[PDB]
Each structure stands twice: as C-alpha cells, then as structure tokens.
Amino acid sequence: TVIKNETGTISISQLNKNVWVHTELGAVPSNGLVLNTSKGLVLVDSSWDDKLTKELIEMVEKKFQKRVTDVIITHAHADCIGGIKTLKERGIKAHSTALTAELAKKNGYEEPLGDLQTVTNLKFGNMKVETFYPGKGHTEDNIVVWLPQYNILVGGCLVKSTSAKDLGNVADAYVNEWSTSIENVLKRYRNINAVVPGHGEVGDKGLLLHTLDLLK
C-alpha cells in the first residue's frame, strides 16, 4: 500500500499496521517514518525543506485525520531538519539531542528541542520508540531509532542501502569511527527484523554489514 502526491515527489508506504515509511525527492530520495498512534501522528525526520515538509504533514494529517504531534530529528542535515520552521509554527515538537540542536543552529536552521539523551524511550499512545546515539559516523550527531514492538531499526544515513556503493557526503563525517558506531548498534540490538536506510529500500541487518563493508 503506497500513496503519492500528484507530482510523485512525496510517497508513503506501509510497513505494517501503524508504521509507514515516507519518502521525499529533493532528484535525491530521503526516508523517514510516519507512526500512526492513538494520540496522533509521530514522524521520524522531516523533509528537505519547508515546502516538502508542510506538504508531507498535510498529506498524512488528511489521510489519518489526526495531527502530527512530534518529530524525531536524527541529525542536522537538510534531508532531516530542513522543515524545522514548519514544525514549530504548527506546534509540532522537534525532538533532538543537544548536539543536534547546536549543530542545527550552526547550520542556519532553527533549533530543535535538544531533549534526547544517549538512550531515550518515548511512548506515544501504545507506540514505543527508542532513540540511540551510537557515536559519530555519517555525521557527529547522528542517532538511530528503534521500534521494540516491531524490531524495526531506522538507521538513517548511518546505514546505506543495498545497491549503494557510495557513502555520500563525508566532509562532515567521521569515516574511521563510523565502523565502531555501527558495531554499537549491532551489539545493542541482537534481533533486528527490518532496517530503514536513510536513502533506499527497506532491508534487514545485512544493510549494516554492507555499510561496514563499504567503510573498510
């Protein structure tokens, strides 16, 4: 089940009952999650900019007939924090680590909450969400999101997709530590089912091993 906007730059596909993957084209695709809970919609990452972000919000709010209440920002790059201004004017709480918040400000973006600690567990209605900071990798502040009820891991851009052979922008990356950080994710979560890459199709733990291979 995949719904799209007339243009095709925004699509939302269902992973299971209350978990959907949202993808926006900036033409570079970017993934994030949409969580349908009993108390509203929760997104993992926004979009490239305020126009796409607003349109994404409008699309999901109309479909689920609920308001988007929270958003988890995985790192301070445009494909994740690009629509921060849109979130703040709609009363949407932009969760982030303190580091992501100071890097967002340093990059000309408005500041997210900076509330997430190294390990933070949030529960929206009956939906459980855990955020984890594994260390530096794709960026200095990147975090991953874990849904313990589905054993779904949002690796964000710390994880590359199956056909990806390029690590992407490494000017802000810590290539040498990236490997250790992925190992911390692997040691922390022993039974992973699906993992959503920052860009690309949903896969499994094999995506982390693949990324470790690219990093060698």
> What are the residues binding Zn ion (CB under 5 A)?
77, 157
Which member of 22, 75, 95, 210 is catalytic? Answer: 75
In the DSSP assignment, the letter for residue 109 is P
95 counts as catalytic: no
Q: Is 169 annotated as a binding residue?
A: yes
CB of 78 to Zn ion, least distance (A): 8
Spatial CB neighbours of 6, under 8 Å, sequence gap ≥ 6: none
Q: Is-contact 181 133, C-beta < 8 A?
A: no
CB of 169 to Zn ion, least distance (A): 7
115 counts as catalytic: no
Looking only at the bridges linking them, the beta strands covering 29-37 and 68-72 are: unpaired
169 counts as catalytic: yes
Is the CB of 140 or the CB of 201 nearer to Zn ion? Answer: 140
Q: Is-contact 126 103, C-beta < 8 A?
A: no
Nearest-10 crossing angle of helices 206-215, 175-188: 160
138 counts as catalytic: yes
Is the CB of 35 or the CB of 159 nearer to Zn ion? Answer: 159
Integer Cα distance of 77 and 40 in angstroms: 26
CB of 113 to Zn ion, least distance (A): 19
Integer Cα distance of 113 and 169 in angstroms: 25
Which member of 22, 45, 70, 138 is catalytic? Answer: 138
- Of 90, 84, 122, 129, which Cα lies nearest the Cα of 103? 84
CB of 20 to Zn ion, least distance (A): 22
22 counts as catalytic: no
Is the CB of 77 or the CB of 205 nearer to Zn ion? Answer: 77
Q: Is 138 annotated as a binding residue?
A: yes
Which member of 16, 126, 169, 176 is catalytic? Answer: 169
Which parts are annotated binding residues?
75, 77, 79, 138, 157, 160, 169, 199
Active site residues: 75, 77, 79, 138, 169
